[PDB]
Paper text:
The crystal structure of the holoNqrC' protein with a covalently bound FMN residue was determined and refined at 1.56 Å resolution. The central feature of the holoNqrC' protein is a twisted antiparallel β-sheet formed by six β-strands: 1, 2, 5–8. The β-sheet is surrounded by α-helices from both sides (the helix A from one side and the helices G and H from the other), which fit to the grooves of the β-sheet. The FMN residue is covalently attached to Thr229 at the beginning of α-helix G. Analysis of Fo—Fc-maps shows clear electron density for the atoms comprising the FMN residue as well as the phosphoester bond, which covalently links FMN to Thr229 that is in a full accordance with earlier prediction. The electron density of Thr229 side chain unambiguously demonstrates its flavinylation. The FMN binding pocket of holoNqrC' (shown on Fig. 4) is formed by N-termini of α-helix G and 310-helix E, as well as by loops 6–7, 8-E and 10-G. The cavity is inlayed by amino acids conservative among [name] subunits from different bacteria (shown in orange on Fig. 4a): Leu149, Trp150, Glu176, Thr177, Leu180, Gly181, Gly227, Ala228, Leu230 and Thr231. The isoalloxazine ring of FMN is squeezed between two loops (6–7 and 8-E with the most involved Leu149 and Leu180) and flanked by α-helix G and 310-helix E. The position of the ring is stabilized by H-bonds with Thr177 and Thr231 side chains (N5FMN-OG1Thr177,N3FMN-OG1Thr231) as well as with backbone of Gly181 and Thr177 (O4FMN-NThr177,O4FMN-NGly181). The obtained electron density of the holoNqrC' protein in the crystals clearly shows that the isoalloxazine moiety of the FMN residue adopts a bended “butterfly”-conformation with ~20° angle between the planes formed by the pyrimidine and benzene rings. This conformation of FMN most likely corresponds to the radiation-induced one-electron-reduced (semiquinone) state of the flavin, which is in accordance with relatively high stability constant for anionic radical of the FMN residue in [name]. As shown in the current work, the isoalloxazine moiety of the FMN residue is buried in a hydrophobic cavity in such manner that its pyrimidine ring is squeezed between Leu149 and Leu180 while its benzene ring is extended from the protein surroundings.
Na+-translocating NADH:quinone oxidoreductase (NQR) is a redox-driven sodium pump that generates a transmembrane difference in electrochemical Na+-potential. NQR consists of six subunits (NqrA–F) encoded by six genes of the nqr operon and has a unique amino acid sequence and set of prosthetic groups. The enzyme contains a [2Fe-2S] cluster, a FeS center, noncovalently bound flavin adenine dinucleotide (FAD) and riboflavin, as well as two covalently bound FMN residues. The [name] subunit plays a role of an electron carrier within NQR.
Author numbering: 36 to 261
């Protein structure tokens, strides 16, 4: 079943955003060496060993969990900034191993675009604030417009940006028509693709908030990884 090729490209994207030099090695090999998947309780931000459905980090299906009322919540329209309708109570994150230390954490985020649900990985430094990279691993927006979330030049703009402001509130901004420079939080919007851009904005506003990875990244900031 492939199914397998889907799992493998996901692993590829994780390795890609992790900034690991692939010394010719294959993806399943690099993933075992450098990646440690962990489950996270969103509300508390704590690492957990199992989800409510009994899954471990190795077999947890967060998308399926999000539609199971036993282990997810229904978001009000106002709460639902990323326009995803529901949120699993437990998330998965991918720790990047240096040696015995954790070098980065990669968090899965998503939000609705114009034509499609848009899924991305965001690589965060162990300060729990600085973005190391971003990659969209599933989206179906129009090439040349919203599809430009896959453009290397647009994604590179996220590198060095801070996720949070001084109150640890979500601070990433999709700035219509080009952010300034020396900008702490701002990246350029997608020209001609405001609706996709709004979906990206909502993605960060929700997933950096109290119902998302907010509590977790706070614990990262306070040294919860190493
Ligand atoms: Cl979710």
């Amino acid at each position: 079943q492939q199914k397998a090729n889907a799992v493998l490209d996901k692993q590829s994207k994780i390795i890609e955003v992790a900034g690991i030099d692939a010394e010719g090695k294959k993806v399943p090999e690099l993933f075992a060496e450098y990646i440690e998947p962990r489950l996270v309780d969103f509300k508390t931000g704590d690492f957990v060993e199992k989800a409510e459905d009994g899954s471990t980090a190795a077999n947890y299906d967060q998308r399926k969990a999000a539609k199971d009322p036993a282990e997810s919540i229904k978001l009000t329209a106002d709460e639902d900034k990323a326009k995803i309708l529901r949120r699993a109570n437990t998330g998965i994150v991918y720790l990047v191993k240096s040696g015995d230390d954790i070098s980065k954490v990669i968090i899965p985020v998503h939000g609705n675009g114009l034509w499609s649900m848009m899924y991305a990985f965001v690589a965060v430094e162990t300060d729990g604030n600085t973005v190391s990279g971003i990659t969209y691993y599933e989206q179906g927006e129009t090439p040349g417009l919203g599809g430009e979330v896959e453009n290397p030049a647009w994604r590179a703009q996220f590198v060095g940006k801070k996720l949070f402001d001084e109150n640890h509130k979500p601070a990433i901004k999709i700035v219509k028509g080009g952010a300034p420079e020396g900008s702490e939080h701002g990246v350029d919007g997608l020209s001609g693709a405001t609706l996709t851009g709004n979906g990206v904005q909502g993605t960060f506003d929700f997933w950096l908030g109290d119902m998302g990875f907010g509590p977790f990244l706070a614990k990262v900031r306070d040294g919860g990884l190493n």
